[PDB]
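in:
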């Protein structure tokens, strides 16, 4: 699944969440999917790549 394009607002929210906790429980990933309008799979990959860059 190739990464989708995130909006400025979606990225801002993602970075803020990452800053709070960089590991994502299944439940939080599901709540973040609902709130941001992104597939849970896109959030998971964004989190994994972000930790790798870090």
């Amino acid at each position: 699944r190739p990464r989708t394009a995130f909006s400025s607002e979606q990225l801002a929210r993602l970075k803020r969440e990452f800053n709070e906790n960089r590991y994502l429980t299944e439940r939080r990933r599901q709540q973040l999917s609902s709130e941001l309008g992104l597939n849970e799979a896109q959030i998971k990959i964004w989190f994994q790549n972000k930790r790798a860059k870090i």
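note: DSSP finds three helices and no strands in the chain.
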